[PDB]
Amino acid sequence: MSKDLQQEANLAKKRYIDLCRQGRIFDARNRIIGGDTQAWDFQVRDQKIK
Amino acid sequence: EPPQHPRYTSLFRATIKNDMKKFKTAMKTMGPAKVEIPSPKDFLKKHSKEKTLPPKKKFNRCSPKKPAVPLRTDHPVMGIQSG
Amino acid sequence: AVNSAFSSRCQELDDSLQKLQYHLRKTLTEITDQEHQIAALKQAIKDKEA
Amino acid sequence: EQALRNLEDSRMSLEKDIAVKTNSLFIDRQKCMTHRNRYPSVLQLAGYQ
Amino acid sequence: MRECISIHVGQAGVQIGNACWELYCLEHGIQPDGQMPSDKTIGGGDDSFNTFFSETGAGKHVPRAVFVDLEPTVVDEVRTGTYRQLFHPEQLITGKEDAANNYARGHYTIGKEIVDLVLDRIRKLADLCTGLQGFLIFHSFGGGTGSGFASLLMERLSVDYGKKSKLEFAIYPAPQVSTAVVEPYNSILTTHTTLEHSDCAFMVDNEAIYDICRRNLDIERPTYTNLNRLIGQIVSSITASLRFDGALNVDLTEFQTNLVPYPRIHFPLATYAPVISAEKAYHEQLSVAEITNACFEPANQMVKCDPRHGKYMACCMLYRGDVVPKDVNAAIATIKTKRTIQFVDWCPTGFKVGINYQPPTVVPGGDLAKVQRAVCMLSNTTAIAEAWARLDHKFDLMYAKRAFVHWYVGEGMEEGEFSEAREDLAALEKDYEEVGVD
Amino acid sequence: MRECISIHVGQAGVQIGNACWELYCLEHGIQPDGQMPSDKTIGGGDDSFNTFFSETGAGKHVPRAVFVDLEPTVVDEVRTGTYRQLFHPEQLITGKEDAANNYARGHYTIGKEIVDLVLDRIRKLADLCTGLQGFLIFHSFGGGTGSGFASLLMERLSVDYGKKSKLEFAIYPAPQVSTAVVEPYNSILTTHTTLEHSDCAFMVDNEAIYDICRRNLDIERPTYTNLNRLIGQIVSSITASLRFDGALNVDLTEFQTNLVPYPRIHFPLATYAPVISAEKAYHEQLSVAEITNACFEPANQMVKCDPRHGKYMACCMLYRGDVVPKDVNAAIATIKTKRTIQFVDWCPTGFKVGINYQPPTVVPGGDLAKVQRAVCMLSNTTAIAEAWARLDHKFDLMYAKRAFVHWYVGEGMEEGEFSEAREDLAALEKDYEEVGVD
Numbered sequence A: 001m002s003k004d005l006q007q008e009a010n011l012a013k014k015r016y017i018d019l020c021r022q023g024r025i026f027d028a029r030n031r032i033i034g035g036d037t038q039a040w041d042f043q044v045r046d047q048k049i050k
Numbered sequence B: 001e002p003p004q005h006p007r008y009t010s011l012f013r014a015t016i017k018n019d020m021k022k023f024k025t026a027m028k029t030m031g032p033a034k035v036e037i038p039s040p041k042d043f044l045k046k047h048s049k050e051k052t053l054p055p056k057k058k059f060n061r062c063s064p065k066k067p068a069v070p071l072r073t074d075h076p077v078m079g080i081q082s083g
Numbered sequence C: 001a002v003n004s005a006f007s008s009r010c011q012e013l014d015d016s017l018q019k020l021q022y023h024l025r026k027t028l029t030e031i032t033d034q035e036h037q038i039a040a041l042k043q044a045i046k047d048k049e050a
Numbered sequence D: 001e002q003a004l005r006n007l008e009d010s011r012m013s014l015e016k017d018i019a020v021k022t023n024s025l026f027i028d029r030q031k032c033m034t035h036r037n038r039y040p041s042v043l044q045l046a047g048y049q
Numbered sequence E, F: 001m002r003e004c005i006s007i008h009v010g011q012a013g014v015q016i017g018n019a020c021w022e023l024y025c026l027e028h029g030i031q032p033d034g035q036m037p038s039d040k041t042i043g044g045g046d047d048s049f050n051t052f053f054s055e056t057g058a059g060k061h062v063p064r065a066v067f068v069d070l071e072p073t074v075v076d077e078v079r080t081g082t083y084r085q086l087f088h089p090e091q092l093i094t095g096k097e098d099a100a101n102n103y104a105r106g107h108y109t110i111g112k113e114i115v116d117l118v119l120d121r122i123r124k125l126a127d128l129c130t131g132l133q134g135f136l137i138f139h140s141f142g143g144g145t146g147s148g149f150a151s152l153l154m155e156r157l158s159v160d161y162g163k164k165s166k167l168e169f170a171i172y173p174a175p176q177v178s179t180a181v182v183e184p185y186n187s188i189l190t191t192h193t194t195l196e197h198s199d200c201a202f203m204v205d206n207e208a209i210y211d212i213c214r215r216n217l218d219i220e221r222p223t224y225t226n227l228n229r230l231i232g233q234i235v236s237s238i239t240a241s242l243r244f245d246g247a248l249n250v251d252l253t254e255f256q257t258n259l260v261p262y263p264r265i266h267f268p269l270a271t272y273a274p275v276i277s278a279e280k281a282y283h284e285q286l287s288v289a290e291i292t293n294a295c296f297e298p299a300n301q302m303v304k305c306d307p308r309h310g311k312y313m314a315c316c317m318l319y320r321g322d323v324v325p326k327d328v329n330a331a332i333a334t335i336k337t338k339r340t341i342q343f344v345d346w347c348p349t350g351f352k353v354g355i356n357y358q359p360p361t362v363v364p365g366g367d368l369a370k371v372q373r374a375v376c377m378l379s380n381t382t383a384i385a386e387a388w389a390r391l392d393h394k395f396d397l398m399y400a401k402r403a404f405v406h407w408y409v410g411e412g413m414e415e416g417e418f419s420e421a422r423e424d425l426a427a428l429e430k431d432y433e434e435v436g437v438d
């Protein structure tokens, strides 16, 4: 029966990327311009000093 | 009288007989019977003993089956209309 | 959201393991070199006694 | 030789950490989601409406 | 299914593949050991790796590529690298004798006894594959071993396998920089051989690659790793359609059908728009419009050709990341209505859009940007003939004074095949203006 | 019931046999003492050993194999070995005079007074046996004591017992390697004597056995222990049908009825597919497909013959391990679809598949692979005539200048018998051509 549960688990993955995709729908709303991009450069500018 | 069966040359005579002898660089390698000491006689002749060999050829390469791309600005048939 | 958080934590833990083994192998190599050097050092001491 | 001894102390700390972390990963990677699969479905949670 | 095989020839062609497969292991989270963590992704080899790796029951992701060289120097060191356990030892086909930049020596002297070995690899890789859309040929025109050996094998894989695609990628010779003066010899030798057999040959020139680095990436001091990263990013971008999905999914078959207008000429130009230093995109914004302006900005191309000196035929754009059709169709509508971009009148539309939702991810210890909206701009224009025009006047002099011929006639070649290529080349240019001429 | 008899002639034919029961005792767990643990497997001699060993009420597994030798050197050292307590003293037939590589010396001078004694072993083994399907003859064409002695005894066992099979196994003469120049003499003598009596003669060659070793087994310096291990594995696989069962069970009679097309020619080729190093098997995968491709790869055969130089008649597959009909029948169907594989049009089907569930086990102190799916490739083709045509051009050279004849005419022969063998051979290739000609 566990195989029926894993195909339930991957469906639980599908709904969540749908939860994610609506997040990415609102991410695109934010990604008019985003902010985690700012966070990324901090490490990039950090290592550049190194 | 049994005729000797014509020795079938499934290559062999052609290849394997000549293949044994061909991959052989012998009569050469450990050393000669002696070094033929070059008596002071001569050397090459005014820049002789060269490798230059200008050949003459035009040999065709394989076939580009790939046919001509254009029709050199020509026409197919269009515009056939009937009232 | 519970399931998502669990998955993220597990991934971080795996990364930590990777770093650990990375350190271990070079520790191994370094100690081997150190031992060989100290043996050469005793030999040099006797040679100097000569 | 002192530095050498310090090196073995470092490595022994390392392997103890290895064992601890391996145990933790086994536990959480095994028990949780395997039991979590039993989570019911939305319609029967709606009561077979 | 949707899988292919990559090939790496020429001593240059193997370090580039290394970085590509180095890049490829990151997006799949491949540990250098060869296995996934306790996470359930291993099986009958059918997952995101099935199109790229072969992670069979042993759990080891086997890359679907064969690395071929003739000098053991580089291949032994990578055999002592970090992922050498991943790489199959005899897929790293090594050699003991070089081609000495000689196309023919790499085509006649040693290639005969080695191709049978690699052909065994091909068929033993052919049998395990299922869909096998085509091949990835990584090489170089100025191939120290790339020129001669690739030419023979691509002939051999063509004759037995003529029903699938063959994708060619080589560094275009630098227009004014030459690390070899015999490089023109084999380069035109390679081109004329491949024209009737190569399916899609894609080029690149390193000078403008360096020029980009200190233009926008602000790196006045880059490295091959950086160069390999961006070409590795380039091939990663075109292969993301195989990896992930998007609004629509497109394949090399569509690429082939829609990009090449007519036979022979199959030499478009790739380009990646969001090439910027991280700190520059830090306080600025990137969107579809400006990257479209940037991707069509003439100095952003890696090939020394002015598009205003030529005319456009085809353009393929591949948006990887988060996009919406609304701005995409509007922006290109502005682009289609742009005056300076001189498309040939023969094509009403020439635009092949590819959409992939997955954002391009960074590489640890990298240098690139932080991209949400990425596009690889593949395009074909008439401004390319100048390069071959640059090539011929170089060759016509040096051939007329027949330099280095003693080398090639010494090892058994002769002038006729050299003669053939020039009108074969002259055929190439004379085709280029007539397609330009409406 | 299901049993057979083993015969070992030639001083080099005994160490190879020695390994067999060294191998055989492992998969049965036979202790070198000669007894199992206290667990109840003893009786009148009826269990997995009953087909091979004779563990009577005394409880000692007695191998059903007579080792005949003409020099007490190697037979006594193994008589001082590890399993000598298992072995019957005078079943280990020792000898006091050599044949000096002379066929007729072992066939006339000394074989007379020895064959009567060894025949006593055969009948005293025959009487205790019940079904005794056939005989296992291990020898060598360059048999210093194999060639001459076997020829006489095989004649004698043929005339008294013509109602049962006799299976012959000899190292084929090394094609381009000759450790003895008289070898073409006695070899052609053996062949013409055996053509009208031998049931099924199977050949192997040492060179290709080593060639495999440093190709995929990755051993640049193996030993006889490995070489004997490989062939001992081969005979173990063919005897697994006697030992264990499978999806279907086959017998040497089926092998005989279906392999030999017509009288005379009974000389197929055997091969083992899963030949790989332990580590290579570790991070790779085994399945029916690739081993089917590997087993039909031309360089995996142990005989210096190009299959594309000839054409196929029969192919027998002995799948030992876990396989299903589905992939097996699908894979062979694709093999039938292959065009390079050239079976003779006389046989639409020539496929004899054998399935055995038991996985091939490893040997302690061994170097073999990890086998879950094995197959033994018994196959006969027309590309075999090269071997004899290699012998005759050698032989016709010496015979015209009649070297070493003073040795042979010295101890009592003439040239007529040497004459017969040449047209006896000349029949073979003229038979080979006609069967080769469709």
Ligand SMILES: Nc1nc2c(ncn2[C@@H]2O[C@H](COP(=O)(O)OP(=O)(O)OP(=O)(O)O)[C@@H](O)[C@H]2O)c(=O)[nH]1
Binding pocket: E009, E010, E011, E012, E013, E015, E016, E071, E098, E099, E100, E101, E140, E142, E143, E144, E145, E146, E147, E171, E179, E180, E224
């Ligand atoms: N794409 C790419 N090209 C390179 C790289 N390094 C050098 N090159 C250039 O590409 C050419 C490679 O051709 P070759 O030099 O003949 O290399 P090869 O045929 O593999 O073998 P060699 O003769 O030993 O060098 C060189 O002439 C360089 O100018 C690199 O890392 N990547």
Ligand SMILES: Nc1nc2c(ncn2[C@@H]2O[C@H](COP(=O)(O)OP(=O)(O)OP(=O)(O)O)[C@@H](O)[C@H]2O)c(=O)[nH]1
Binding pocket: F009, F010, F011, F012, F013, F014, F015, F016, F071, F098, F099, F100, F101, F139, F140, F142, F143, F144, F145, F146, F147, F171, F179, F180, F224
């Ligand atoms: N069958 C077999 N042959 C071997 C082995 N090792 C080497 N050989 C070769 O096989 C040949 C064995 O035949 P012979 O030399 O005639 O041996 P013999 O007939 O038992 O008696 P001798 O003439 O005394 O050696 C040798 O010449 C070797 O070249 C082995 O382990 N088994």
